[PDB]
């Protein structure tokens, strides 16, 4: 909650960029409020963003930087799924219990359950993470969870 | 999967293919409905105790009390085989599971120890030999619910444990318990057959007993007007060695009175069918039913009853049973005479307050078939001869008194006759081979409450009362042995609890029935006499005994007092009890018949070397003493509607039965303890989501961690050695707490991905910015340049080379 | 640069229509009309306080060299556009670039937009940023 002038700087760095990508004018479109937060390392939920000011579509509300701090500070207090959290979840769709699951079910979970992801988005994350589905048509979710968590740029 | 299972199991597939909805344990619930008993609803808003909802069906809105709302089970518990596994176990949840399975053609459904059976009102392919081969020796859980399983397991329990078995079948009139009892037998006979046949007799005994104990009622076209306890004896090799029968509360009032659209026992119409003209004379009857007043009161015919065929078969049934010609005919003779009894009329007032006869025709015929003197009969029937000590007297009879003594005679004669019949059948089925063990099948009317309840209903409810107590006790022992078996033993008391107060209030020393019997041996005993005495002993002393309250349904009839039975407080009217208890019967007429010349008649009225209530209570104690020394089994027959229409369910009716059935009381009984239980293995698989950050990655361990983690209320649960116990509705909470989290966790994983993508496009955005920046800066220069007055001239001055 | 400064002299070798080694306030309007157009008697006094000393092609290159200042190279610009073409097709979709310029960064107004795309090289919906780059710079031919 209380932010480090470091964190705020970083916050200004990212707020700078986004303000630019929709017309430089010290204002950022709410439909990006969440996207700005993500570039900072936070993983807000569609609900968390809508609860702090975020909007549904573009061109409805723009926010000054002075209104991003409060908003960002809020999103920092939301829950962040841990490894166990995710694993037990997937584990529930695992019959046998040997860490596998059908790609269909995977895409099913991701686009049908919870605040659904667009098929275009799921299509995009399997490519970046490179979750290869073996011979029969199932994947090792344990690995897919680590990569989504490990992030685009590894170590 | 398999032809024989068409009306047993539905489709695991077609039930997984139930997708016209997810389910919100937060919004979906049941609500009271006048037409469908209960109704599916979607909560809307709440203002304290006033919940507002929408009915999925008509989509309207009604306001109900939060306390009247009942939990609704998720779609995964649709048409469940054993409702003792349903996350939410209640009135509505049970009614729905029954309705659903029934409308799908399934009629057998478990509910713990119970095996509920709804009358299909249409024959089904479920009872074939082929089907039988499938249930042989299979445990109840490893196969679709079926009556054959209650029977089979009973048999295999008898062999395995070496102990008597008892199968109690109850239910209202028309519920199909009789046909169920038969089925049970056909089964035991087809899995333990010797090596006509013994089995044949057990089978032929039906015709004759049905001829005397069954009649047509608005509820059933062939209703057993008597309770029957049938015991099946086996040998050391598990084969049927023999059997015997015991009857209870035969409805004698029928012998001389029928309600509209009802008949008297089938036998009377068979003897007047003219199927065996050669007997018309030995009985002195004319082949016309509407001719005799003891049987032409209600209706005379029945659609599915061929009174002419049935009589022929009955005749044969006797033969196959070994009855002697002299016996069979004696039976017919005694029967025919009752017809003539109702045909005797009397002349009243010559110049006296005492009656006289009006012809003999009728009294002569009766005398003939009964082997006595008609002058004697009528002289005793008219002015009696009592037995006053040291100097017996003569009494004067009335117009009323005499006609009511004839009906008494018929009623009393029929009963004796029927008891002799059952005893005779027994005599046949008793192949002297003093067996090893047995398995008895009970078949009596169930607990039923009406608009007007009388001495008859008391006897019924009083019996089931003792019977229900027998269940609670069984359930009690079962529960104890389970808890102790899981090291989680506990307090307890016993389920045969509030049941004893009511029972004692009826069968004990200064209780109801006792007062009824005491108050009979007195001549000048009034209705308000019995009342006065009744009130004095228990009114204001007994909680289970109170005064009439606010009528519950339309048309409640009079009532003198209320009795708190386990099924509810039943208003009884003691009007007539005195007369209905004792059978006023010409002590004189009896003597004459005692000296009758017909062997059957003589034996029927032979004196020693009485009251209904004292007889039943004695034969009930025997029954119970027997039952408590057997291993119980329960079959709850239920009637879906008053139209005999298949697939039609009437909520207000099924619910009523469930209330008195024993299922609802069996659920409340099990609520005290810890109902729903899961074996640790399952618990972790299902609820690890509720505490991922506390899981190491044993079995009870994980569970003990999940529960402790959830800050579980110590009372709510308990820890067995193989499985964990939970209070009613607890798992339900754990269920919802499971949906919210799994959902949030998925959402959270979905967000982490959204966060992954963007961060990945970040570097590109940082670059594309300076890029676009360049473009815009530059494109603006060339645009300014080409607009600078010096350039157009500086460069339009270019065109040479 | 090297030869523009030399071609200036040789193109400032016409701007000398009265040939004095100096040009002049009137002198321009005689080198203009002699082709059309005609910058007013005042489109020169705000356009004459432009020489950090008298004028005459060596004091002309310190006026052309200085509002011309602030540009980037051809590779720099065609590498800028080459940041929105991952497939490396050497072309950007028309609506895409228009959108980039008009609603992102330092937005263009309907005017700058109209002026930029008048002579923009667009074939079948594709914008040739490589060709367009040459235009703006001069390597090819520029038009208004
Ligand atoms: Ca902006
Ligand atoms: Mg000059």
The two three-digit tokens of residue B590, written as one number = 């009896």
Look up the CATH number of the domain holding residue A64.
Answer: 1.10.238.10
C64 and C83 assigned to the same domain: no
* Rounded (to 5) percent helix, strand, coil in chain A: 50, 5, 40
For B521, which DSSP code? S
Distance from CA of A15 to the nearest CA of B (A): 12
CATH classification of the domain holding C22: 1.10.238.10
- Number of structural domains, chain C? 2
In a domain, C50, yes or no: yes
Give the pairing type, strands B240-248 and B724-726.
Answer: unpaired
Cβ <8 Å between C47 and B786: no
Structure tokens at B530: 């019995």
Short-list B337, B338, B379, CA closest to B356: B379
Q: Is residue B238 within 8 Å of residue B192, measured between CB atoms?
A: yes
Contact B627, B166 (CB under 8 A): yes
Q: Testing the interface with B: which of A24, A92, A119 to mutate, by most B Cβ within 10 A?
A: A92
Contacts of B22 in chain A (CB under 8 A): none
Q: Is C142 a member of any domain?
A: no
Asked if C71 lies within 8 A of B781 by C-beta distance, the reply is: yes
- Per the structure, the count of domains in chain A is 2
> Do residues C6 and C60 both lie within one domain?
yes
Residues C106 and C132 in one domain: yes
Token pair recorded at residue B487:
């090291």
Q: Resolution in A for the shown PDB structure?
A: 2.8
Alpha carbon distance B72, B94 (integer Å):
10
Residues B525, B414: Cα–Cα separation, whole Å: 27
C-alpha to C-alpha distance for B687 and B532, rounded to whole angstroms: 63
Contacts of B712 (CB under 8 A, 6+ apart): none
Last residue of a domain, one of C69, C86, C106: C69
Q: Which CATH architecture has domain B672-734?
A: 2-Layer Sandwich (3.30)
Domain boundary among A80, A99, A115: A80
Strands (E), B298-394: 346-347, 356-357
Q: Are residues C65 and C107 in the same domain?
A: no
How is residue B88 annotated by DSSP? Answer: S
**Single residue among A38, A57, A80 that ends a domain in this structure:** A80
Do the Cβ atoms of B176 and B639 come closer than 8 Å? yes
* Shared-domain flag, residues C60 and C5: yes
CA distance B646 to B643: 9
Cβ-Cβ contacts under 8 Å for A7 (sequence gap 6 or more): none
Taking the CA atoms of chain B, what radius of gyration do you get in angstroms? Answer: 37
Does residue A75 sit in the same domain as residue A27? yes
Choice among B224, B405, B463, B661 that is catalytic: B224
Rounded to an integer, what is the distance from CA A74 to the centroid of its chain? 16
Which residue in B52, B103, B157, B173 is the catalytic one? B173
Has B175 been labeled as part of a binding site? yes
C16 is in an annotated binding site: yes
Q: Tell me the β-bridge partners of B442.
A: B168, B229
What is the β-pairing status of strands B437-443 and B165-170?
parallel
Query: B752 with A48: CB under 8 angstroms?
Result: no
C103–A20 C-beta distance less than 8 A = no
C45 shares its domain with C93: no
Residue C10 is assigned to a structural domain of this protein = yes
Query: What does the DSSP assignment read for B199-219?
Result: HHHHHHHHHHHHHHHEE--SS
Among residues B688, B725, B682, the alpha carbon closest in space to that of B710 is found at B688
A148 and A86: one domain? yes
- Contact (CB, 8 A) for C119 and C144: yes
End position of a domain, from candidates A49, A80, A111: A80
Q: Tell me which residue range forms the domain holding C92.
A: 70-137
CA distance C90 to chain B (A): 15
Contacts of A among chains (3+ CB pairs under 8 A): B, C
Which token pair is A36?
């700005």
- Closest to A11 (Cα-Cα) out of A68, A62, A94, A50: A68
> Is residue C66 a known part of a binding site?
no
Cβ contact B767–C83 (<8 Å) = yes
Q: With contact defined as beta carbons under 8 Å apart, do C20 and C37 qualify?
A: no
Query: Does C103 reach chain A within 8 Å, measured CB to CB?
Result: yes
Q: Are residues A73 and A115 located together in one domain of the fold?
A: no
Question: CA B765, B771, B773 angle in degrees (round to 5)?
Answer: 105
Residue B446 catalytic? yes
| B174 annotated as a binding-site residue | yes
Same domain, C1 and C64: yes
C144 assigned to some structural domain: no
Phi first, then psi, for residue C11 (nearest 5°) are -130, -5
Distance CA C75, CA C83 (A): 12
- CATH classification code of B455-628: 1.20.58.530
Give the integer Cα–Cα distance in Å for B430 and B426.
6
Q: Are residues A39 and A100 in the same domain?
A: no
Specify the DSSP class assigned to residue C18: S
Domain end residue (candidates: C25, C44, C69): C69
> Look-up: residue for tokens 């910015």?
B769
| Residue C76 sits in the same domain as residue C115 | yes
DSSP B431: -
Tokens encoding C121: 């090289």
In terms of domains, do C100 and C111 share one? yes
- Cα–Cα distance for residue pair B528/B149, rounded to 1 Å: 51
Spell out the residues 6+ positions from residue A25 whose beta carbon is closer than 8 angstroms to its own: A19
CA distance B150 to B153: 6
Q: Are strands B165-170 and B214-215 parallel, antiparallel or unpaired?
A: unpaired
**How remote is the CA of residue C47 from the centroid of ligand 2, in Å?**
16
Domain end marker among C69, C89, C120:
C69
**B407, B343 Cβ separation under 8 angstroms:** no
One domain for residues A96 and A122: yes
Closest residue of chain A to C102, computed from CA coordinates? A23
Say yes or no: C62 and C78 in one domain. Answer: no
Residue B724: strand pairing partners: B678, B719
| A73 shares a domain with A93 | no
- Enumerate the β-bridge partners of residue B545: B563
- What is the DSSP-derived secondary structure letter of residue A2? P
Nearest bound ligand to the CA of residue C104: 1
Q: How far is CA B417 from CA B397, B412, B582, B609, B727, in A?
A: 26, 9, 18, 21, 55
Neighbours of chain B (3+ CB pairs under 8 A): A, C
Indicate whether A95 and A74 sit together in one domain: no
Mutate to test the interface with B, among A11, A35, A127 (most CBs of B within 10 A): A35
Domain with A58, as residue range(s), is: 3-80
3-state secondary structure of B594: helix
Asked if residues C106 and C140 have their Cβ atoms less than 8 Å apart, the reply is no
H or E element that contains B678: strand B677-678
Residue C93 in contact with residue C84, Cβ under 8 Å? no
Q: Do B771 and C84 touch (CB under 8 A)?
A: yes
Token readout for B100 is: 């659903």
Minimum CA–CA partner of B778 in chain C: C71
Asked if B413 and B600 touch (Cβ cutoff 8 Å), the reply is: no
Q: Say if residue A109 is in the same domain as residue A132.
A: yes
CA distance B234 to B189: 11
Residue C76 lies in a domain: yes
What count of other Cβ atoms lies within 10 Å of the Cβ of residue B230? 23
- Is position C42 within any domain? yes
Between CA B135 and CA B146 the distance in angstroms is 9
Residues A56 and A39 in one domain: yes
- B344: closest CA among B354, B356, B334? B356
Q: Are C104 and A22 in contact (CB under 8 A)?
A: yes
Phi, psi (degrees; rounded to nearest 5) at A9:
-60, -55
Are C6 and C22 within one domain? yes
């Amino acid at each position: 909650p209380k932010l480090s002038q470091d964190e705020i700087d970083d916050l200004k760095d990212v707020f700078e960029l986004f303000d630019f990508w929709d017309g430089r004018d010290g204002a950022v479109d709410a439909f990006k409020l969440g996207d700005v937060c993500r570039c900072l390392g936070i993983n807000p939920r569609n609900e968390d963003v809508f609860a702090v000011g975020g909007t549904h579509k573009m061109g409805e509300k723009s926010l000054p930087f002075e209104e991003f701090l409060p908003a960002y500070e809020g999103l920092m207090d939301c829950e962040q799924g841990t490894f166990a959290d995710y694993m037990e979840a997937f584990k529930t769709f695992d019959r046998e219990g040997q860490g596998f699951i059908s790609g269909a079910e995977l895409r099913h979970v991701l686009t049908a359950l919870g605040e659904r992801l667009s098929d275009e988005d799921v299509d995009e994350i399997i490519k970046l993470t490179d979750l290869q589905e073996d011979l029969e048509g199932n994947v090792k979710y344990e690995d897919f969870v680590k990569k989504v968590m490990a992030g685009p740029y590894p170590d | 999967s398999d032809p024989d299972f068409q009306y047993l199991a539905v489709d695991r597939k077609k039930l997984m293919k139930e997708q016209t909805a997810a389910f919100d344990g937060k919004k979906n619930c049941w609500v009271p409905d006048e037409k469908e008993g209960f109704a599916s609803a979607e909560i809307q808003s709440s203002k304290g105790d006033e919940i507002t909802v929408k009915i999925v069906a008509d989509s309207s809105t009604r306001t109900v009390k939060k306390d009247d709302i009942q939990s609704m089970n998720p779609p995964k518990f649709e048409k469940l085989e054993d409702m003792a596994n349903m996350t939410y176990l209640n009135e509505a949840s049970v009614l729905y599971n029954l309705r659903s399975r029934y409308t799908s053609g399934l009629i057998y459904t478990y509910s713990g120890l119970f095996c509920i059976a709804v009358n299909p009102y249409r024959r089904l392919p479920i009872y074939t030999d082929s089907v039988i081969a499938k249930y042989r020796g299979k445990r109840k859980t490893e196969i679709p619910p079926h009556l054959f399983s209650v029977a089979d397991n009973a048999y295999q329990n008898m062999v395995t444990d070496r102990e008597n078995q008892s199968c109690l079948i109850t239910g209202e009139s028309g519920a199909g318990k009789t046909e169920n009892t038969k089925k049970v037998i056909m089964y035991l006979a087809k899995v333990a057959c010797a090596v006509g046949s013994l089995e044949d007799q057990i089978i032929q005994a039906n015709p004759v007993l049905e001829a005397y104990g069954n009649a047509k009622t608005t509820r059933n076209n062939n209703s057993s007007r008597f309770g029957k306890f049938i015991r099946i004896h086996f040998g050391p090799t598990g084969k049927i060695a023999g059997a015997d029968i015991e009857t209870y509360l035969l409805e004698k009032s029928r012998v001389t009175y029928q309600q509209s659209a009802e008949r008297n026992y089938h036998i009377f119409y068979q003897i007047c069918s003219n199927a065996i003209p050669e007997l018309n004379d030995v009985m002195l009857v004319t082949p016309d039913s509407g001719l005799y007043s003891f049987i032409n009161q209600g209706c005379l015919t029945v659609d599915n009853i061929d009174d002419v065929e049935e009589f022929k078969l009955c005749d044969e049934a006797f033969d196959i049973l070994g009855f002697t010609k002299e016996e069979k005919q004696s039976m017919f003779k005694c029967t025919a005479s009752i017809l003539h009894m109702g045909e005797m009329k009397f002349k009243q007032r010559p110049r006296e307050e005492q009656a006289e006869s009006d012809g003999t025709a009728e009294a002569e015929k009766v005398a003939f078939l009964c082997g006595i003197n008609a002058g004697d009969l009528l002289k005793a029937l008219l002015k009696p001869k009592v037995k006053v000590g040291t100097e017996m007297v003569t009494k004067g009879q009335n117009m009323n008194q005499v006609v009511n003594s004839v009906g008494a005679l018929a009623k009393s004669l029929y009963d004796r006759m029927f008891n002799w019949l059952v005893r005779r059948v027994n005599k046949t089925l008793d192949t002297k081979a003093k067996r090893n063990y047995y398995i008895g099948v009970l078949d009596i009317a169930g607990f039923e409450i009406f608009d007007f309840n009388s001495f008859e209903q008391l006897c019924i409810n009083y019996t089931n009362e003792r019977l229900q107590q027998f269940f609670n006790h069984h359930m009690f022992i079962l529960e104890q042995e389970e808890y102790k078996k899981e090291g989680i033993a506990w307090e307890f008391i016993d389920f045969g609890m509030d049941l004893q107060m009511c029972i004692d209030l009826i069968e004990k020393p200064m209780g109801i029935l006792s007062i009824l019997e005491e108050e009979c041996m007195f001549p000048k005993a009034d209705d308000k006499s019995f009342q006065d005495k009744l009130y004095q002993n228990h009114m204001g002393k007994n909680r289970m005994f109170t005064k009439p309250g606010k009528p519950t349904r339309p048309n409640q009839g009079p009532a003198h007092f209320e009795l708190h039975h386990y099924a509810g407080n039943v208003p009884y009217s003691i009007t007539g009890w005195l007369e209905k208890n004792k059978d006023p019967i010409n002590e004189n007429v009896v003597a004459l018949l005692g000296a009758s010349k017909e062997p059957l008649v003589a034996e029927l009225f032979k004196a020693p070397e009485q009251t209904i209530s004292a007889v039943h209570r004695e034969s009930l104690n025997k029954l119970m003493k027997n039952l408590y020394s057997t291993h119980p089994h329960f079959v709850r027959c239920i009637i879906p509607n008053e139209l005999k229409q298949p697939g039609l369910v009437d909520a207000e009716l099924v619910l009523h039965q469930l209330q008195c059935n024993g299922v609802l009381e069996g659920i409340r009984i099990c609520r005290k303890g810890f109902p729903s239980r899961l074996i640790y293995s399952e618990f972790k698989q299902r609820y690890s989501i509720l505490a991922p950050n506390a899981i190491p990655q044993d079995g009870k361990t994980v569970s003990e961690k999940i529960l402790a983690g959830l800050q579980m209320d110590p009372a709510e649960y308990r820890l067995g050695t193989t499985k964990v116990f939970f209070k009613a509705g607890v798992l339900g909470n754990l269920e919802e707490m499971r949906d919210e989290r799994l959902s949030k966790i998925i959402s959270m994983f979905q967000a982490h991905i959204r966060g992954y993508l963007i961060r990945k496009a970040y570097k590109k955005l940082q670059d594309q910015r300076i890029g676009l920046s360049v473009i815009q800066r530059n494109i603006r220069k060339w645009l300014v340049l080409r607009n600078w007055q010096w350039w157009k001239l500086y460069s339009k001055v270019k065109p040479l080379l | 640069p090297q030869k523009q400064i030399q071609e200036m002299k040789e193109a400032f070798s016409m701007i000398d229509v009265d040939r004095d080694g100096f040009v002049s306030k009137e002198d321009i309007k005689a080198i203009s009309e002699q082709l059309g157009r005609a910058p007013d008697d005042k489109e020169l006094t705000a356009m004459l306080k432009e020489a950090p000393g008298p004028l005459n092609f060596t004091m002309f290159l310190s006026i052309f060299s200085d509002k011309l200042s602030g540009t980037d190279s051809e590779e720099t610009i065609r590498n800028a556009f080459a940041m929105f073409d991952e497939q490396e097709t050497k072309k950007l979709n028309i609506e895409y670039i228009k959108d980039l310029l008009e609603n992102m960064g330092d937005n263009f107004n309907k005017d700058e937009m109209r002026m930029t795309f008048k002579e923009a090289p667009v074939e079948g919906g594709k914008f040739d940023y490589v060709k367009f780059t040459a235009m703006i710079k001069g390597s090819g031919e520029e038009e208004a």
